[PDB]
């Protein structure tokens, strides 16, 4: 019927579904339509034993953990988005500290909903789309946004501590540069292909170092799950450009002590001296801190829209936005387990929490993966 | 001719009374052409004779014309603001 | 075109089909020559042989290409003037041509778009190449052509006589009078200037034009 | 060392000297192996050398070169949707083309240029590699794979900060269109940043004219999402506020036109600020000055946007040229038609000032030429004075030669045929010729038509028509009504205005009928003729030398006379008789031609065809049964055969047609259908209301090089024809027609095919309402 | 006049530029001198050693 009408495309699926510790979700309590086709984060924060989790529908839940049961469920509104009074469609993921479920919107908003009812204990607008999850630290709800702005908002009552542009991308090379505080600097990357550390006191540029190019005529990866967000394991500062070129900069000057400009790393953690990273090939691999010495790699993972490789249930778990979870041999690259618990899958990082692996997929959003 | 109206004979390019009073006998062609410009008909035969001339007939009700020519000398200095009417 | 052959293979199979009159199979091998050998030693002649092929295949703008592709690319021949001939010779037949001739209506009062170009090239022949055998047509092919410019321009003086825009009669005529020194349509433009002047009551100015008739009686 | 000679190996697109002078050690120069290595690079610095191997025979150079030039072939592959030439332009952007110096350094800018071309396509996942593949003696193949990953589509233009407009109802009237489910299709939603730029300027022209002078679009953040398809556009804008256009300060060079130059800038002071009216009231003055002969009409507004009361005040800077502007005119693109025939279409005269409308009214008269395809103007201001303009009405003529025919049996049953050929004012004569005719064994028809369309400069179309219809309707004889109707019909055209053009003429219709069919409407009008001949036999005659008076008039505002997209032609034509005619009737009729663009792209254009007519006797008569109205079957409504709209002829009881054919041409005859039958051929009505509703429609699979000349026209066609003398008297136990309730219907597609012999319209319909007496010909193919 | 197994036809054409010799020269009396030529109208006549038209050199 509908086959002969349309045209064709291409991608790369998952090989070697492994189950050596046979995985499963422990609860299933999904928020709704989860991350969506905006560059969005809906990262479920689990506090009060409650997965405060949101989707790109404005709907924020309170999925009380060990069953994900609803403590509360609110749907947030926007104020300038297309006209006004529109659902939040959250770009920033759920941050929770105190009675404050901080979620950032795709239109302009960054919230903080009280963690008993989800009533917005404050919301504070950021300039354009909150490119980052609302990173909440030191009285500052630090967001790097669509306009390249490190925006710090007051985490108790809502008040813009500052909003400072660092690396405005071209149109908006959508880079979650999410501002991590290190050495007095909220270290927050560059969406056009840079990395910065910016002083956490009021947003003073400690350094911004250009890492890789911009997307458009200097063609680098837009298709990367951009984690311009600096994972600052000590001041060899591990971070990414817009394509995800891993770079290890100085914390006070940006001196790139080594880089995987060679890489265009999508999702990376620096597990001590083991930079467990989803590469541009979506190869899960381990790198050092003083170099990108490939302590191991993985070709079992190869072009799935992966999450971050996180150690849980004895193995390095990495889901994807194809729903395949993958428990990686942490010592070398091998699928120990695979859980295809979604098929729209997780554009949020696997929250190895509650004794589970809490996730947010796009359709079957909040599960909690076990083995 | 019993016609009261048909598509009318028409023209433009004829000096306003401003354009006549903008200039004087003695005024050079360029000095004449400062706000009069050039006509669309001058004299290739004799002197500078700048014919700014109208033509019109409003439906066989008497044909109209405004032949406002500027006879200069060959130095271009105006010698005649020659403004002939209809017929 | 023939494939990547030696040039004189392609030049011979160009040249025979000129002598065969197989001008397409000349162009098949005049240009497959110039495909890999436009630096052929005869590529100046090939360009002329292209005009020999094109215009005798009646490919007049393609000749006009190879006419200019002679003078631009390989002008090294004394048939630049032939090219200046064939430029207009393209441009003369490029302007006024129709199937209306068997019924008996005009072509020369029409617009002279390419005919003004043939007016140029046959002038550029008799000016820029006045030595040439090609000037012989070219001198003749200015004479009708300025009258073809005249009888085109006279038609507007003819029409604006009908319009009653009597300035606009003289606008063509005195322009034509300034244009054409010998064409009859200009001598026939000539009284319309006086005629229009008399409707505009420039009767004395009209008789300036009437004494031209006393001189263009001669 | 000094080189004695150089060996020039492998050049084939470049010369020895093209090598030799790009050798820094040329022949005779002192040669070094430094100069050899200088020679390797600089011969490669030709860009026409695939490899350079300069060596020496002691000092005698020997340069060994493979070269990448003249490219033998360029291949494109994997380009599933995008055409290979569109990719070739980015190769031709990168200087890589067939028969040319390849540079294999330029393999990448082929591809990087192409993927960035692919970015601007409406994709971003679309990749390309170029392949260099050498071929005889210099040649190469330039193969290209194309990795078309996915296109890009706009998803939601996230116009944040939007404080007077809901972006969602803006997108429905934006250019980036949406809503394609399996129950709605408007067209695809591909990511067009160029439409998006117009969308933000739709958004600007949404705001700015309400009051929003200091509306501003703050920022714009396209969702460069890791899919390379999902495009959201996080636009920051700021409403500003409603301003009020609250003053008009129009000044500058006004040239004595100062009063209406104020009035062409009328606002009310306090009018909620219209930014578009501000620009409008500029050009309001500009055409005005362009009517005086100033196409130096420089008119520049200035809203003094006064936020102290949230208002603006419109300063306007007006320049009003110098007079007497149109020096002369020219024409071009009429190398085949005489220019003064086209100059008398023109209304701007030389020796005038510029009427900019005068230039274009004759150009609109040039637009309504019909023997054209496009018309332009070229209003060259002649320098040296701002009284000096030459207006070159560059035009383009139409095709010449059109043919028609007819069939039904030939060459074996006598010589029976139909003919017809057209000249289309052949190559621009000023003489329109279209000639037709038919000779069959049942009738022989003669007709002539010639027109001098510009016999006089007013617009007098010297056009005459004559006719000799030796029509017998031969069964084997006058056994089915003769009509030897002959004579002439001459008509002249007269423009009194530029759209108002009148028509009038006379008709000599020397009718000579005999053996008229016993259908009552023949006699019913003959009963109004004073004739009461045989109801029961076809033996009866009808002679009338109908001295008739024809008339007409056009309104001509439909733009093209060739292939319009917009406008309206209102074209009247009717007839009446005179005292002295052998019949005293009239017939008035009116048709139209109006093109209404559905979209403003004018490839979606409504076409209105509707026919209305009435005629009866002027006194004591009728308009004839042979003058009654009709439609159906390629006339207005398709899916029928001809004469299916109208009073369907009812017979008297009949015996013998002077040889009624034995059970053929049966007419309630003695040979069948006996005693008051009715055939399903329309004798038609003395009144008419029939129509057709076609559409200019785009064809995205037909190349629009001739789909602007092919009018693929879907229709639903309808209409009624009734007689005000077919009232239910004899046609009472039969189809009665007295009203516009006799409507036929069909829907389908017309396919106008502009051949070199003209437009060819083939149609197919299904009669969805078929009234009484209607034949069905769904397959109707006309030439 | 009557078809006889693949007859042929007749067409028409024009080459009048070839035969045109300079026409009756416009003059002017004194005090009335129009410029006679404002272009390449006044034929800069050369008729060097060859024919008129396509009878001349072909390549």
UniProtKB/Swiss-Prot annotation, chain B:
GO terms under biological process: Gram-negative-bacterium-type cell outer membrane assembly; protein insertion into membrane
Keyword annotations of the record: Cell outer membrane, Lipoprotein, Membrane, Palmitate, Signal
Gene Ontology CC: Bam protein complex
Location(s), subcellular: Cell outer membrane
Record GO terms (molecular function): protein-macromolecule adaptor activity
Chief localization: membrane
Bilayer topology annotation: Lipid-anchor
Subunit structure and binding partners: Part of the Bam complex, which is composed of the outer membrane protein BamA, and four lipoproteins BamB, BamC, BamD and BamE.
Family: Belongs to the BamE family.
Function, in words: Part of the outer membrane protein assembly complex, which is involved in assembly and insertion of beta-barrel proteins into the outer membrane.
UniProt-recorded name of the protein: Outer membrane protein assembly factor BamE
Organism: Escherichia coli O6:H1 (strain CFT073 / ATCC 700928 / UPEC)
Whole sequence portion shown: 24 to 110 of 113
Curated annotation (Swiss-Prot), chain C:
The keyword Amino-acid biosynthesis is assigned to this record: no
Entry similarity comment: Belongs to the BamD family.
Major localization listed first in the record, in broad terms: membrane
Taxonomic superkingdom: Bacteria
GO CC list: Bam protein complex
Protein name per the record: Outer membrane protein assembly factor BamD
Classification via Gene3D superfamilies: Tetratricopeptide repeat domain (1.25.40.10)
Protein localization: Cell outer membrane
Topological type in the membrane: Lipid-anchor
Record keywords, A-Z: Cell outer membrane, Lipoprotein, Membrane, Palmitate, Signal
Protein's GO biological process: Gram-negative-bacterium-type cell outer membrane assembly; protein insertion into membrane
Subunit structure: Part of the Bam complex, which is composed of the outer membrane protein BamA, and four lipoproteins BamB, BamC, BamD and BamE.
Pfam families: YfiO (PF13525)
CDD domains xrefs: BamD
Swiss-Prot record, chain D:
Entry keyword Signal: yes
Subcellular location: Cell outer membrane
Primary location class: membrane
Keywords: Cell outer membrane, Membrane, Repeat, Signal, Transmembrane, Transmembrane beta strand
Gene3D superfamilies: membrane protein fhac (3.10.20.310), membrane protein fhac: a member of the omp85/tpsb transporter family (2.40.160.50)
Gene Ontology CC entries for this record: Bam protein complex
Pfam families: Omp85, POTRA
GO BP term, pick one: protein insertion into membrane
Domain named POTRA: residues: 1-68, 69-149, 152-240, 243-321, 324-398
InterPro entries (alphabetical): Bac_surfAg_D15 (IPR000184), BamA/TamA_POTRA (IPR010827), D15-like (IPR039910), OM_assembly_BamA (IPR023707), POTRA (IPR034746)
PROSITE patterns: POTRA
Taxonomy, superkingdom: Bacteria
Keyword set includes Ubl conjugation: no
Function description: Part of the outer membrane protein assembly complex, which is involved in assembly and insertion of beta-barrel proteins into the outer membrane. Constitutes, with BamD, the core component of the assembly machinery.
Quaternary state and interactors: Part of the Bam complex, which is composed of the outer membrane protein BamA, and four lipoproteins BamB, BamC, BamD and BamE.
Family the UniProt entry places it in: Belongs to the BamA family.
Name recorded for this polypeptide: Outer membrane protein assembly factor BamA
Protein's organism: Escherichia coli O45:K1 (strain S88 / ExPEC)
């Amino acid at each position: 019927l509908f086959n002969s009408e349309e045209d064709v495309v291409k991608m790369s699926p998952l090989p070697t579904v492994e189950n050596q510790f046979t995985p499963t979700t422990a609860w299933s309590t999904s928020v709704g339509s989860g991350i969506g086709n905006f560059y969005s984060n809906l990262h479920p924060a689990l506090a009060d034993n409650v997965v405060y989790a949101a989707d790109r529908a404005g709907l924020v839940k309170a999925l009380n953990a060990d069953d994900g049961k609803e403590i509360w469920s609110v749907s947030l509104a926007e104020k300038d988005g297309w006209f006004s009074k529109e659902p939040a469609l959250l770009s920033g993921g759920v941050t929770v500290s105190g009675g404050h479920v901080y979620i950032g919107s795709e239109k302009a908003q960054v919230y903080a909903l009280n963690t008993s009812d989800g009533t917005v204990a404050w919301q504070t607008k950021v300039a354009g789309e909150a490119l980052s999850r609302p990173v909440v630290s030191d009285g500052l709800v630090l967001i790097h946004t669509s306009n390249g702005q490190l925006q710090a908002l007051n985490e108790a009552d809502g008040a813009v501590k500052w909003t400072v542009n660092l690396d405005m991308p071209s149109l908006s090379l959508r880079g979650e540069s999410a501002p991590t505080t290190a050495f007095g600097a909220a270290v927050v990357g560059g969406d056009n292909g840079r990395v910065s550390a910016v002083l956490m006191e009021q947003g003073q540029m400690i350094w911004q170092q250009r890492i890789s190019q911009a997307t458009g005529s200097t063609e680098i990866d837009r298709l990367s799950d951009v984690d311009t967000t600096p994972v600052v394991v000590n001041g060899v500062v591990f971070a990414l450009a817009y394509n995800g070129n891993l770079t290890a900069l100085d914390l006070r000057s940006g001196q790139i002590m080594w880089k995987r400009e060679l890489g265009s790393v999508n999702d990376f953690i620096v597990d001590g001296n083991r930079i467990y990273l989803v590469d541009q090939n979506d190869r899960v691999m381990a790198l050092t801190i003083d170099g990108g010495v490939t302590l191991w790699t993985q070709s079992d993972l190869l072009h799935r829209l992966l999450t971050s490789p996180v150690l849980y249930n004895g193995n390095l778990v990495v889901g994807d936005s194809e729903g395949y979870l993958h428990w990686i041999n942490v010592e070398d690259g091998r699928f120990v387990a695979q859980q295809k618990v979604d098929s729209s899958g997780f554009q949020t990082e696997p929250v190895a929490a509650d004794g589970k692996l809490l996730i947010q997929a796009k359709d079957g959003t909040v599960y909690s993966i076990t083995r | 001719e019993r016609v009261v109206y048909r598509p009318d004979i028409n023209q433009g390019n004829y000096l306003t009374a401003n354009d006549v009073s903008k200039i004087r006998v003695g005024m050079t062609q360029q000095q004449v052409a400062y706000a009069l410009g050039t006509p669309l008909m001058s004299d290739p035969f004799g002197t500078n004779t700048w014919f700014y001339v109208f033509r019109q007939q409003p439906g066989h009700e008497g044909v109209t014309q405004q032949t406002l020519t500027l006879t200069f000398n060959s130095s271009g200095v105006l010698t005649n603001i020659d403004n002939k009417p209809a017929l | 075109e023939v494939p990547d052959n030696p040039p004189n293979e392609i030049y011979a199979t160009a040249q025979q089909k000129l002598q065969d009159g197989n001008w397409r199979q000349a162009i098949t091998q005049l240009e497959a020559l110039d495909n890999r050998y436009p630096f052929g030693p005869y590529s100046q002649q090939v360009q002329l042989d292209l005009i020999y092929a094109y215009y005798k295949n009646a490919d007049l703008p393609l000749a006009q290409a190879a006419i200019d592709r002679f003078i631009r690319l390989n002008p090294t021949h004394p048939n630049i003037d032939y090219v200046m001939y064939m430029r207009g010779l393209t441009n003369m037949a490029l302007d006024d041509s129709a199937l209306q001739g068997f019924f008996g209506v005009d072509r020369s009062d029409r617009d002279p778009q390419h005919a003004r170009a043939a007016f140029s090239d046959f002038s550029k022949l008799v000016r820029g190449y006045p030595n040439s055998q090609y000037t012989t047509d070219a001198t003749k092919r200015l004479v009708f052509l300025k009258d073809r410019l005249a009888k085109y321009e006279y038609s507007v003086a003819e029409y604006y006589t009908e319009r009653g825009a009597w300035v606009a009669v003289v606008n063509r005529v005195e322009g034509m009078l300034r244009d054409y020194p010998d064409t009859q349509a200009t001598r026939d433009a000539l009284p319309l200037m006086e005629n229009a002047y008399r409707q505009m009551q420039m009767n004395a100015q009209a008789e300036k034009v009437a004494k031209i008739i006393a001189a263009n009686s001669s | 060392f000094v080189v004695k000679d150089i060996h020039f190996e492998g050049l084939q697109r470049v010369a020895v000297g093209a090598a030799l002078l790009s050798m820094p050690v040329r022949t005779g120069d002192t040669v070094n192996d430094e100069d050899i290595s200088n020679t390797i690079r600089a011969l490669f610095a030709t860009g026409n050398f695939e490899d350079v191997r300069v060596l020496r025979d002691g000092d005698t150079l020997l340069v060994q070169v493979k070269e990448r030039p003249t490219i033998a072939s360029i291949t494109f592959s994997g380009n599933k949707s995008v055409k290979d030439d569109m990719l070739k332009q980015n190769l031709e952007a990168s200087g890589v083309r067939v028969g040319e110096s390849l540079d294999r350094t330029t393999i990448a800018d082929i591809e990087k240029g192409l993927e960035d071309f692919y970015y601007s396509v409406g994709k971003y996942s679309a990749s390309v590699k170029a392949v260099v593949t050498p071929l005889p003696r210099n040649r190469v193949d330039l193969k290209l794979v194309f990795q078309e990953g996915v296109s890009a589509e706009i998803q939601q233009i996230n116009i944040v900060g939007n404080h007077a407009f809901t972006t969602d109802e803006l997108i429905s009237h934006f250019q980036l269109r949406d809503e394609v489910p399996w129950w709605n299709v408007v067209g695809d939603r591909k990511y067009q940043k160029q439409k998006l730029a117009g969308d933000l300027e739709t958004l600007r022209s949404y705001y700015l004219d309400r009051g929003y002078a200091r509306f501003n679009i703050d920022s714009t953040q396209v969702s460069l999402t890791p899919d390379k398809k999902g495009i959201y556009v996080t636009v920051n804008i700021t409403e500003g506020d409603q301003y009020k256009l609250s003053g008009v300060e129009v000044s500058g060079n006004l040239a004595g036109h100062s009063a209406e130059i104020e009035q062409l800038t009328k606002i009310e002071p306090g009018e909620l600020y219209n930014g578009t009216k501000v620009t409008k009231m500029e050009d309001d003055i500009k055409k005005l000055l362009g009517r005086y002969g100033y196409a130096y009409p420089r008119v520049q507004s200035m809203p003094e946007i006064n936020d102290a009361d949230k208002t603006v005040k419109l300063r306007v800077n007006v320049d009003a040229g110098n007079r007497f502007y149109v020096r002369k005119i020219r024409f071009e693109g009429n190398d085949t038609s005489k220019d003064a025939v086209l100059r008398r279409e023109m209304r701007q005269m030389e020796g005038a000032w510029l009427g900019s409308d005068l230039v274009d009214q004759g150009k609109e008269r040039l637009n309504r030429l019909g023997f054209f395809e496009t018309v332009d103007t070229d209003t060259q201001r002649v320098p040296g004075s701002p009284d000096q303009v030459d207006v070159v009405y560059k035009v383009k003529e139409r095709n010449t030669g059109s043919f028609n025919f007819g069939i039904g049996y030939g060459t074996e049953s006598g010589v029976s045929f139909q003919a017809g050929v057209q000249q289309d004012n052949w190559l621009g004569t000023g003489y329109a010729v279209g000639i037709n005719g038919t000779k069959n064994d049942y009738q022989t028809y003669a007709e002539l038509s010639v027109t001098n369309p510009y016999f006089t400069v007013d617009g007098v179309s010297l056009g005459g028509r004559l006719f000799y219809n030796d029509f017998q309707a031969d069964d084997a004889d006058l056994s089915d009504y003769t009509n030897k109707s002959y004579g002439t019909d001459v008509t002249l055209g007269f423009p009194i205005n530029e759209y108002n053009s009148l028509r009038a003429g006379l008709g000599y219709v020397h009718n000579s009928l005999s053996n008229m069919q016993p259908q009552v409407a023949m006699w019913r009008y003959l009963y109004s003729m004073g004739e009461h001949p045989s109801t029961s036999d076809q033996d009866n005659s009808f002679k009338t030398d109908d001295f008739t008076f024809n008339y007409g008039w056009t309104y001509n505002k439909l733009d093209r006379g060739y292939f319009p997209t917009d406008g309206s032609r209102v074209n009247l034509t009717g007839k009446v008789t005179i005292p002295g005619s052998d019949n005293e009737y009239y017939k008035v009729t009116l048709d139209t031609a109006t093109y209404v663009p559905i979209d403003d792209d004018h490839k979606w254009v409504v076409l209105g065809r509707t026919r209305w007519g009435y005629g009866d006797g002027l006194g004591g008569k009728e308009m004839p049964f042979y003058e009654n109205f009709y439609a159906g079957g390629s006339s207005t409504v398709r899916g029928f055969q001809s004469n299916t709209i109208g009073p369907k002829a009812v017979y008297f009881p009949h015996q013998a047609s002077n040889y009624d054919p034995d059970y053929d041409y049966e007419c309630a005859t003695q040979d069948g259908a006996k005693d008051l039958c009715k055939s399903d051929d329309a004798v038609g009505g003395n009144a008419m209301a029939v129509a057709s509703l076609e559409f200019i429609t785009p064809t995205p699979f037909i190349s629009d090089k001739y789909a602007n000349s092919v009018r693929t026209s879907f229709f639903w066609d309808m209409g009624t024809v009734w007689d005000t003398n077919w009232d239910s008297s004899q046609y009472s136990g039969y189809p009665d027609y007295s009203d516009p309730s006799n409507i036929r219907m069909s829907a389908g597609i017309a396919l106008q095919w502009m051949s070199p012999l003209g437009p060819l319209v083939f149609s197919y319909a299904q009669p969805f309402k078929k009234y009484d007496g209607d034949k069905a010909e769904q397959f109707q193919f006309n030439i | 006049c009557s078809s006889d197994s693949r007859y042929k036809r007749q067409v028409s054409g024009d080459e009048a530029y070839l035969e045109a010799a300079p026409l009756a020269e416009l003059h002017a009396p004194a005090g009335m001198i129009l410029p006679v030529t404002s272009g390449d109208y006044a034929i800069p006549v050369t008729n060097g050693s060859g024919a008129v038209g396509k009878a001349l050199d072909i390549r």
